Design a protein around this motif. Structure first.
Motif, PDB file in Angstrom:
ATOM      1  N   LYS A 201      13.245  43.820  31.672  1.00  0.00           N
ATOM      2  CA  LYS A 201      13.389  44.354  33.020  1.00  0.00           C
ATOM      3  C   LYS A 201      12.331  43.866  34.007  1.00  0.00           C
ATOM      4  CE  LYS A 201      16.406  48.322  32.209  1.00  0.00           C
ATOM      5  NZ  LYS A 201      16.375  49.821  32.262  1.00  0.00           N
ATOM      6  N   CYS A 202      11.363  43.100  33.494  1.00  0.00           N
ATOM      7  CA  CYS A 202      10.299  42.521  34.314  1.00  0.00           C
ATOM      8  C   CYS A 202      10.635  41.059  34.684  1.00  0.00           C
ATOM      9  CB  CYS A 202       8.923  42.660  33.633  1.00  0.00           C
ATOM     10  SG  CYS A 202       7.571  42.069  34.685  1.00  0.00           S
ATOM     11  N   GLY A 203      11.241  40.895  35.864  1.00  0.00           N
ATOM     12  CA  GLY A 203      11.716  39.612  36.284  1.00  0.00           C
ATOM     13  C   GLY A 203      11.206  39.060  37.614  1.00  0.00           C
ATOM     14  N   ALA A 204      10.409  39.845  38.352  1.00  0.00           N
ATOM     15  CA  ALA A 204       9.829  39.397  39.639  1.00  0.00           C
ATOM     16  C   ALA A 204       8.454  38.714  39.494  1.00  0.00           C
ATOM     17  CB  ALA A 204       9.742  40.549  40.593  1.00  0.00           C
ATOM     18  N   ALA A 205       8.053  37.912  40.487  1.00  0.00           N
ATOM     19  CA  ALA A 205       6.789  37.200  40.382  1.00  0.00           C
ATOM     20  C   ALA A 205       5.640  38.186  40.204  1.00  0.00           C
ATOM     21  CB  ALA A 205       6.539  36.260  41.608  1.00  0.00           C
TER      22      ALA A 205
END
Ligand SMILES: CC[N+](C)(C)CCCS(=O)(=O)[O-]
Length: 357
Positions: free
Chosen positions: A325-329
């Motif tokens: 669920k951790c996909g942002a910069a």
């Protein structure tokens, strides 16, 4: 090294969180900086991240980029320095989130803040206006401006004090890394005068040092913007957007850092730590308190942690940390003082908590 992801959250503003810093100067409490605010959280068991209180700037157009902790020499309590797009340094009491005082340079964006490792009053700011400034936050004095004739020719993005606070390495959009020694007679004397200055007892303004000439400079490390730098003893760790942290030193392999002269034409590469998908700029690595470990996030939410406890820089051991669920910069990471927790903050305003096992 093994960490397990134990919690995550998202701040309501939906703007990037550019910065995160655990408090090592007395406290487990961390600050996040994004939008026009700074937010304090406290870590608890079963991965709880307890929301405390924010400072929200009166200007809705301010964008805070960074923060840094220190001690109040007058009250003994921890203090938090914040700055960003407006180029104003806010000194915030973290207990009440009151703004106690502020500093204005020329008013151009501040990209980094760092406090001196031995003197909690000496704050270094680096600016979009090509200059570094050193402030004394006990006497509210500009001690020195590092810039001008042979300073940076474009935005300064990062800087770091060495272990003793005798010298600063800075880096920027001009692709260069520059050394500025602050243990010269000139600089030790100027720091001493900053402490002797009380505007109530005198007619003079405090006269700042204009330091136009760095003590070493190179453009031979990276081929683009240099957006993060750190000392590792007498060696340097730095990065650009070319998916690498380079470990290097001024001069030839056997040259002592303190015998390096401003004319030095050589550098030495001791290692390079490659990774993936981190070619946007202003992506900052961090180390733990002891400098046993090095942590960097990339633009798709993957964390890289390097074990620096090996005989030579090139032998560093990498572990990677991912969550579905951790996909942002990830813009910045911070380790707690006891090295037991790692926080990563992201472009989508999300915070990620990783506990060591
Ligand atoms: C807000 C921080 N600054 C220094 C402006 C870097 C922005 C880089 S970006 O556009 O990838 O967010």
């Amino acid at each position: 090294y093994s960490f397990k992801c134990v919690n995550s959250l998202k701040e309501d503003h939906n703007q990037p969180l550019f910065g995160v810093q655990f408090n090592w100067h007395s406290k487990l409490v961390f600050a996040t900086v994004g939008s026009n605010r700074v937010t304090l959280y406290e870590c608890h068991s079963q991965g709880e991240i307890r929301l405390l209180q924010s400072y929200v700037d009166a200007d809705a157009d301010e964008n805070f980029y960074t923060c840094a902790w220190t001690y109040d020499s007058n009250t003994s309590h921890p203090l938090l320095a914040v700055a960003g797009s407006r180029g104003i340094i806010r000194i915030i009491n973290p207990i009440t989130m009151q703004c106690i005082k502020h500093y204005v340079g020329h008013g151009n964006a501040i990209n980094e803040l760092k406090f001196h490792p031995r003197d909690p009053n000496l704050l270094l700011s680096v600016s979009k206006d090509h200059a570094l400034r050193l402030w004394n936050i006990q006497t509210d004095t500009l001690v020195a401006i590092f810039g001008g004739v042979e300073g940076h020719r474009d935005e300064v993005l990062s800087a770091d004090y060495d272990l003793l606070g005798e010298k600063i390495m800075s880096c920027g959009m001009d692709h260069s890394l520059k050394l500025w020694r602050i243990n010269s007679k000139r600089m030790m004397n100027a720091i001493k005068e900053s402490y002797d200055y009380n505007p109530n007892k005198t007619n003079r303004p405090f006269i700042s040092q204009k330091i136009h000439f760095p003590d070493f400079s190179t453009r031979d490390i990276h081929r683009n913007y240099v957006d993060c730098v750190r000392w590792l003893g007498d060696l340097i760790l730095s990065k650009s957007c070319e998916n690498a942290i380079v470990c290097w030193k001024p001069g030839k392999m056997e040259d002592d850092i303190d015998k390096i002269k401003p004319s030095e034409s050589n550098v030495t590469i001791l290692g390079r730590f490659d990774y993936s998908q981190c070619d946007i700029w202003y992506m900052r690595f961090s180390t733990d308190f002891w400098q046993k470990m090095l942590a960097l996030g990339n633009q798709v939410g993957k964390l890289y942690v390097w074990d620096l406890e090996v005989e030579d820089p090139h032998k560093a051991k990498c572990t990677t940390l991912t969550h579905h669920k951790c996909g942002a910069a990830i813009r910045q990471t911070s380790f707690s003082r006891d090295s037991s927790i790692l926080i990563a903050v992201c472009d989508d305003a999300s915070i990620w908590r990783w506990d060591r096992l």
